[PDB]
């Protein structure tokens, strides 16, 4: 789907959903009463992985999965984890993202079956009970999601600019698979809420070049871009890999999930 491809600078993404880092951290403090900063990041990583598994099981293209991931992040950038259960929100984000695209639809029974099967087969370390929600909960949650994103549905990702950069380098076979995988990894951080996607793409490509010992200094010099911001993004990517190393998702998440604030019922 190439809709709005050259419109980023007049887009809802750019104009409303490139957030201030200090505003984001300010809104986050409500949930940091229950969780440490490290625990909150681990929770973000976990639900990114959940959304990825849901999308893979549904056979969705990576761009749809990425859109679902940014819907999830946008929701919890603004609201508390207790507002709506993230176990319900994740499949809802996948459902809505799938409908913004045009090549195929995710049916109701297929979404619920995917949520149930994926959580059982790939996430039983986190979740002792089966997926408890039915399709009416997804549909209700979808209305809240759409409203609370201010109906902003078109999301730009680093994949398209990355492809253009790697083509321009003439290094598709060398650098693209690794750089693409590093783009996937950036969704385990806040970067998509903070930087234009092309900047994230350049940072991922830089790390790919360093890993593979490819000298691209002159090519990165030929770009008219704020390299200080690219370096900021690289530092977050390098930090993610150190956290990844020190994080055992499977051993820690049940404990972290129990510490999450939970939706208060009616009186």
């Amino acid at each position: 789907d190439k809709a709005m491809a050259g419109n980023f600078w007049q887009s809802s993404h750019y104009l409303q959903w490139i957030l201030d880092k200090q505003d984001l951290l300010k809104e986050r403090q409500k949930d940091l009463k229950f969780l440490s900063e490290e625990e909150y990041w681990k929770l973000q990583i976990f639900f990114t992985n959940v959304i990825q598994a849901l999308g893979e099981h549904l056979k969705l293209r990576q761009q749809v999965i990425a859109t679902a991931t940014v819907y999830f992040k946008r929701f919890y950038a603004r609201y508390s984890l207790k507002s709506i259960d993230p176990v319900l929100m994740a499949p809802t984000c996948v459902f809505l993202a799938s409908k913004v695209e045009e090549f195929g639809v995710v049916s109701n029974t297929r979404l619920i079956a995917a949520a149930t099967s994926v959580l059982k087969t790939r996430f039983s370390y986190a979740f002792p009970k089966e997926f408890p929600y039915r399709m009416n909960h997804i549909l209700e949650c979808e209305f809240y999601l759409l409203e609370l994103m201010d109906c902003c549905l078109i999301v730009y990702h680093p994949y398209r600019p990355l492809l253009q950069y790697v083509q321009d380098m003439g290094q598709e076979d060398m650098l693209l698979p690794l750089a693409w995988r590093i783009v996937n990894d950036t969704y385990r951080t806040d970067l998509c809420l903070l930087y234009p996607p092309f900047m994230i793409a350049l940072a991922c490509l830089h790390v790919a070049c360093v890993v593979q010992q490819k000298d691209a200094r002159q090519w990165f010099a030929e770009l008219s871009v704020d390299m200080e911001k690219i370096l900021e993004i690289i530092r977050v990517i390098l930090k993610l890999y150190e956290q990844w190393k020190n994080f055992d998702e499977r051993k820690e998440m049940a404990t972290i999930l129990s510490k999450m604030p939970k939706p208060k019922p009616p009186p």
Binding site: K82, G104, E140, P265
Partner: protein, 343 residues
């Protein structure tokens, strides 16, 4: 869901029935849903609004894509989404627009019923091309362009400005195959083209332009699965002539080409041409208007002009120049929309 979160959002939610007076003010009902002429209940402004309750419940592909695209698109000749209201109780979606009193269907009928300043037709075409070009430059196809969907603003600050509406937002796999008229459908659609294209929109603009010039649909035929429609093709050939091999080399690649060859003979249409058709409806074939029309109504979609090139045509540099107000400051003779009282 957190209860405090729920009651807070319920307290704060703007509801269409509380914000707008639209009871008994329905101006249209169709596949799109229900369209009302609305006014704000608090007197903050005195403007007229259009309120559309989308057909069905929940968020359909049509609704999802309509909201997704209109949330981003910003151009004077594309209808602007002002607000979205989500009604949780009945799962209904409401879209708010600035109200367009007129559209090309009703303008054309008004002229047809009579049997227009100098540059009205030209001004309409230019603005249609401007709006479609903006969509196309953003890789958005309209896919259902017709006189009924080309709105024109009435009295107010946007007097006589074209607003392209009803963009046909959801077509599975971008495919035309997945009371109907085929008068604005490009011949490649009729021969089984698997995907919508920019060229398909351009053909429809050509049809609309011919209709604005004559007040008659150029490829008129009877109304009413299979994309192949025999009588519609017959009508196109009776107007345009039958394409030579050299006119449309890739016609052989169309899935219904062999059906076309079975049903039609070239010789049937030997004295038929757009020149002769337009001569009968008092359009001069040596006019710049005609030469542009002929470029829009090219049978081979790869030989059809783009919206950009159409906007650059010297037709638009010839007196009279197109105007922002297509009525050119003259008094609007067209009647206002009537309200629907049918059950």
């Amino acid at each position: 869901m957190d209860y405090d979160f729920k009651v807070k959002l319920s307290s704060e939610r703007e509801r269409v029935e509380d914000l707008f007076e639209y009871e008994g003010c329905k101006v249209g009902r169709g596949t799109y849903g229900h369209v009302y002429k609305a006014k704000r209940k608090d007197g903050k402004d005195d403007k007229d609004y259009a309120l559309k309750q989308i057909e069905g419940t929940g968020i359909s592909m049509s609704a999802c894509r309509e909201i997704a695209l209109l949330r981003e698109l910003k151009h004077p000749n594309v209808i602007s989404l002002q607000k979205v209201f989500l009604s949780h109780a009945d799962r209904k979606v409401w879209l708010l627009f600035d109200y367009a009193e007129h559209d090309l269907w009703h303008i054309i009928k008004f002229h047809r019923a009579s049997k227009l300043p100098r540059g009205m037709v030209k001004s309409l075409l230019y603005q249609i091309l401007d709006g479609i070009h903006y969509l196309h430059a953003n890789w958005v196809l309209h896919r259902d362009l017709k006189p009924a969907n080309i709105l024109v603003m009435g009295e107010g600050p946007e007097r006589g400005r074209v607003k392209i509406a009803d963009m046909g937002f959801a077509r599975l796999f971008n495919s035309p195959l997945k009371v109907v008229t085929f008068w604005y459908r490009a011949p490649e659609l009729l021969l089984g083209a698997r995907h919508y294209t920019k060229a398909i929109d351009i053909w429809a603009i050509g049809c609309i332009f011919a209709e604005l010039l004559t007040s008659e649909p150029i490829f008129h035929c009877r109304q009413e699965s299979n994309p192949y429609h025999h009588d519609q093709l017959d009508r196109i050939f009776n107007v345009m002539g039958f394409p030579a091999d050299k006119d449309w080399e890739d016609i052989k690649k169309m899935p219904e080409h062999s059906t076309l060859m079975k049903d039609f003979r070239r010789n049937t249409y030997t004295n038929c041409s757009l020149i002769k058709y337009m001569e009968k409806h008092k359009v001069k074939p040596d006019s710049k208007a005609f030469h542009l029309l002929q470029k829009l109504l090219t049978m081979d979609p790869i030989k059809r002009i783009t919206s950009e090139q159409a906007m650059q045509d010297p037709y638009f540099l010839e007196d009279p120049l197109p105007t922002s107000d297509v009525f050119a400051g003259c008094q609007i003779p067209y009647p206002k929309r009537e309200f629907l009282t049918e059950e």
